[PDB]
Structure formats: structure tokens, C-alpha cells
Scaffold this active site. Structure first.
Site, PDB file in Angstrom:
ATOM      1  N   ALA A  68      41.821  72.024  31.766  1.00 41.22           N
ATOM      2  CA  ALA A  68      41.139  73.080  31.018  1.00 41.22           C
ATOM      3  C   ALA A  68      40.618  72.594  29.665  1.00 41.22           C
ATOM      4  O   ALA A  68      40.809  71.436  29.289  1.00 41.22           O
ATOM      5  CB  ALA A  68      42.058  74.281  30.834  1.00 41.22           C
ATOM      6  N   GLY A 115      38.635  69.839  29.477  1.00 45.21           N
ATOM      7  CA  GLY A 115      37.634  69.667  30.513  1.00 45.21           C
ATOM      8  C   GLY A 115      37.841  68.421  31.354  1.00 45.21           C
ATOM      9  O   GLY A 115      38.902  68.220  31.947  1.00 45.21           O
ATOM     10  N   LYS A 175      34.283  62.611  27.123  1.00 44.01           N
ATOM     11  CA  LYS A 175      34.572  63.973  27.533  1.00 44.01           C
ATOM     12  C   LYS A 175      33.304  64.780  27.345  1.00 44.01           C
ATOM     13  O   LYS A 175      32.687  64.717  26.280  1.00 44.01           O
ATOM     14  CB  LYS A 175      35.718  64.564  26.700  1.00 44.01           C
ATOM     15  CG  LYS A 175      36.235  65.894  27.232  1.00 44.01           C
ATOM     16  CD  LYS A 175      37.592  66.281  26.649  1.00 44.01           C
ATOM     17  CE  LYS A 175      37.524  66.552  25.153  1.00 44.01           C
ATOM     18  NZ  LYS A 175      38.729  67.281  24.631  1.00 44.01           N
ATOM     19  N   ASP A 216      49.235  72.187  22.679  1.00 47.89           N
ATOM     20  CA  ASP A 216      49.689  71.737  23.982  1.00 47.89           C
ATOM     21  C   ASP A 216      50.100  70.258  23.923  1.00 47.89           C
ATOM     22  O   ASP A 216      49.482  69.397  24.544  1.00 47.89           O
ATOM     23  CB  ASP A 216      48.620  72.005  25.051  1.00 47.89           C
ATOM     24  CG  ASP A 216      49.174  71.907  26.477  1.00 47.89           C
ATOM     25  OD1 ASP A 216      50.418  71.996  26.665  1.00 47.89           O
ATOM     26  OD2 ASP A 216      48.359  71.748  27.415  1.00 47.89           O
TER      27      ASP A 216
HETATM   28  C1  0RS Z   1      46.881  55.844  37.510  1.00 51.17           C
HETATM   29  N1  0RS Z   1      45.905  56.081  36.450  1.00 51.17           N
HETATM   30  C2  0RS Z   1      45.131  57.290  36.746  1.00 51.17           C
HETATM   31  C3  0RS Z   1      46.531  56.044  35.116  1.00 51.17           C
HETATM   32  C4  0RS Z   1      45.617  55.353  34.080  1.00 51.17           C
HETATM   33  C5  0RS Z   1      46.264  55.331  32.683  1.00 51.17           C
HETATM   34  N2  0RS Z   1      46.561  56.707  32.288  1.00 51.17           N
HETATM   35  C6  0RS Z   1      45.969  57.360  31.257  1.00 51.17           C
HETATM   36  C7  0RS Z   1      46.334  58.702  30.989  1.00 51.17           C
HETATM   37  C8  0RS Z   1      45.747  59.401  29.916  1.00 51.17           C
HETATM   38  C9  0RS Z   1      44.791  58.729  29.134  1.00 51.17           C
HETATM   39  N3  0RS Z   1      44.046  59.123  28.043  1.00 51.17           N
HETATM   40  C10 0RS Z   1      43.314  58.036  27.743  1.00 51.17           C
HETATM   41  C11 0RS Z   1      42.310  57.928  26.606  1.00 51.17           C
HETATM   42  O1  0RS Z   1      41.809  56.847  26.324  1.00 51.17           O
HETATM   43  C12 0RS Z   1      41.928  59.145  25.830  1.00 51.17           C
HETATM   44  C13 0RS Z   1      41.408  59.012  24.533  1.00 51.17           C
HETATM   45  C14 0RS Z   1      41.063  60.176  23.838  1.00 51.17           C
HETATM   46  N4  0RS Z   1      41.200  61.421  24.342  1.00 51.17           N
HETATM   47  C15 0RS Z   1      41.703  61.573  25.574  1.00 51.17           C
HETATM   48  C16 0RS Z   1      41.818  62.957  26.075  1.00 51.17           C
HETATM   49  C17 0RS Z   1      40.760  63.852  25.774  1.00 51.17           C
HETATM   50  N5  0RS Z   1      40.705  65.138  26.166  1.00 51.17           N
HETATM   51  C18 0RS Z   1      41.736  65.601  26.892  1.00 51.17           C
HETATM   52  C19 0RS Z   1      42.852  64.828  27.258  1.00 51.17           C
HETATM   53  C20 0RS Z   1      43.899  65.387  28.015  1.00 51.17           C
HETATM   54  C21 0RS Z   1      45.006  64.592  28.376  1.00 51.17           C
HETATM   55  C22 0RS Z   1      45.087  63.242  27.987  1.00 51.17           C
HETATM   56  C23 0RS Z   1      44.040  62.700  27.220  1.00 51.17           C
HETATM   57  C24 0RS Z   1      42.902  63.472  26.845  1.00 51.17           C
HETATM   58  C25 0RS Z   1      42.053  60.456  26.342  1.00 51.17           C
HETATM   59  N6  0RS Z   1      43.552  56.991  28.576  1.00 51.17           N
HETATM   60  C26 0RS Z   1      44.502  57.389  29.499  1.00 51.17           C
HETATM   61  N7  0RS Z   1      45.050  56.679  30.524  1.00 51.17           N
HETATM   62  C27 0RS Z   1      47.562  57.300  33.174  1.00 51.17           C
HETATM   63  C28 0RS Z   1      47.019  57.420  34.606  1.00 51.17           C
END
Ligand code: 0RS
Length: 258
Positions: free
Chosen positions: A13, A14, A32, A117
């Protein structure tokens, strides 16, 4: 466009993608793509960027519906806990990560932003073990929701310290502390552990009255290894009353961080 989507990070909830920043050396960025309230929230974001706090995700650009370019971090707190070697996280590594976590929180509170959150799924951990807060200041899991949010009564900054205590704990447990199936269930799970609050600690004019629940448990059970200084601090993050709950600024000065 200057950027190039190589994958999706997740949806909610994007929508957030992993991309290449072609003009800046093909580094990984995070894209995003999402009315004055929106302009407003973005104005704050752009403003917060200027300070370049080490404990919050960098904003690189705002593309003119609307695309926001942030930095990319290799992983979140959740995968860091999944992939962590046994039997857990180094006490010292917890003490440090919490500090970095409280830093960005105070930074955000000091500018009157409320995350609203805060969960390990948007707490990002970089190559070096630097905590960086993501997913805030813009318009599934209640396991980190504060009692007042659950009761729908107060929405101020104490909300995010309830979450901090929940994460703090999980850094020991490696499993979520209160897993509830819904808002009422959730509220139950909390009170089973901290105990029924005083009668004046229940907010007034909330559909859910204190009488709809039924004693306090000791914390060392659900969280083992926690010191006295960890315990004390953790207790003041999970105080039922938002007014009695600690603050990030006040947390940064806890004896536990000596
Ligand atoms: C197995 N694969 C799928 C894994 C790959 C590595 N990994 C992640 C998880 C979250 C991650 N955020 C990020 C970012 O760089 C990032 C930077 C700035 N804003 C956000 C962001 C923006 N808006 C909403 C958000 C909501 C939740 C989390 C971040 C948000 C993300 N890189 C991630 N890598 C775990 C799964």
C-alpha cells in the site's frame, strides 16, 4: 528514462523496483512510482534529504504518475535475521543496530515525521551493517502496531517506539514477539505479556473497553539473554500508555548504551 528496471523488490500500500542508474555508473537504485498533501509530503522528503542523515535511506531524485529515486540496499532486517549464523545475533551487534535505529527515529521525530509502520521489512541493512530507515512520509502486519493505533486513539510519535521494542525483542527471538490474527487478537497477545494497564491508562471513547480483556508475565521468558539494562529499556518502549512510553531522544541516553 535514465533508469532501467531489473527486478521488483516488493509490492504493498505502492510498488518498488531495483534498477540501474545509467548516468551514474550503473549503480543500483530504488524506484517507486506513486493534490497538495502529496506535494507536501514530498517537500518534506526533499527537505529531510538535505540533512543527509546516515541512518535514513538517501533520496537521489524526484521524477516529474510520480517516480522517486532512492538508493538501493542489499537487504532488509528480515533477511539479515533469516541468514544470521547460530545461535543468533552478537549482543554487541544488537546494541549497535538499535542505536542506529534510534538515531534515525529521533532524527525523524525531531522533524515531526512519524513513520507509522516501522517493521523489519523496511529496516534496511547495508554492506557494512549500517541501519537505514525506508518507507516513510508517504500515503498485512499488525505485529508491530502500538496499542493506541490498535484501539485507534492516538497517532503521534510514541507509536514508533512501541515498534522499536518489538524489533529489539525480535533481534533476540529471531521470531516476531506478538503474532496476532487481527486487531483484537493482536491487542490480546500484547496484554497477555505486559499485563492489564491501570484504568486511567485506557484511552477514553474507544470502542474497545478495558473490561474486554483479562495479568503480567516476566519478560526474560519470551526474551532470553536480555540484560537488566536491555530489560528496563525494553519495558519503557512497551509501556501501554503513550505518554509514559519513552522517546528516541530519551532512549539514546539509556544506560544500556554505555
Ligand atoms: C529475495 N529477494 C526478493 C530479497 C532481496 C533483498 N530484499 C530487500 C528488501 C527490501 C528492500 N528495500 C530496498 C531498497 O533499496 C529501498 C530503498 C528505499 N526505499 C525503499 C522502500 C520504499 N518504499 C516502500 C518500501 C517498503 C518496504 C521496504 C522498502 C521500501 C526500499 N532493497 C531491499 N531489498 C529482501 C528480499
Amino acid at each position: 528514462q535514465q533508469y532501467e528496471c531489473v527486478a521488483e523488490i516488493g509490492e504493498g500500500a505502492g510498488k518498488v523496483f531495483k534498477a540501474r542508474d545509467l548516468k551514474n555508473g550503473g549503480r543500483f537504485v530504488a524506484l517507486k512510482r506513486v493534490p497538495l498533501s502529496t506535494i507536501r509530503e514530498v517537500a518534506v522528503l526533499r527537505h529531510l534529504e538535505t540533512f543527509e542523515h546516515p541512518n535514513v535511506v538517501r533520496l537521489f531524485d524526484v521524477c516529474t504518475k510520480l517516480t522517486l529515486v532512492f538508493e538501493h540496499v542489499d537487504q532488509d532486517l528480515t533477511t539479515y535475521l533469516d541468514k544470521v549464523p547460530e545461535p543468533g545475533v552478537p549482543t554487541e551487534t544488537i546494541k549497535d543496530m538499535m542505536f542506529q535505529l534510534l538515531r534515525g527515529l529521533d532524527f525523524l521525530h525531531s522533524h515531526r515525521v512519524v513513520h507509522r509502520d516501522l517493521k523489519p521489512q523496511n529496516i534496511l541493512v547495508t554492506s557494512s551493517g549500517q541501519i537505514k530507515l525506508a518507507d516513510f512520509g508517504l500515503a498485512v502486519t499488525l505485529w508491530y502496531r502500538a496499542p493506541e493505533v490498535l484501539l485507534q486513539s492516538s497517532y503521534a510519535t510514541p507509536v514508533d517506539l512501541w515498534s522499536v521494542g518489538c524489533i529489539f525483542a525480535e533481534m533476540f527471538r529471531r521470531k516476531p514477539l506478538f503474532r496476532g490474527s487481527s486487531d483484537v487478537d493482536q491487542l490480546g497477545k500484547i496484554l497477555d505479556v505486559i499485563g492489564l494497564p491501570g484504568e486511567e491508562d485506557w484511552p477514553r471513547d474507544v470502542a474497545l473497553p478495558r473490561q474486554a480483556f483479562h495479568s503480567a508475565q516476566p519478560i526474560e521468558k519470551f526474551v532470553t539473554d536480555i540484560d537488566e539494562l536491555g530489560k528496563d529499556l525494553l519495558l519503557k518502549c512497551l509501556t501501554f500508555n503513550p505518554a509514559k512510553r519513552i522517546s528516541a531522544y530519551s532512549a539514546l541516553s539509556h544506560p544500556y548504551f554505555q
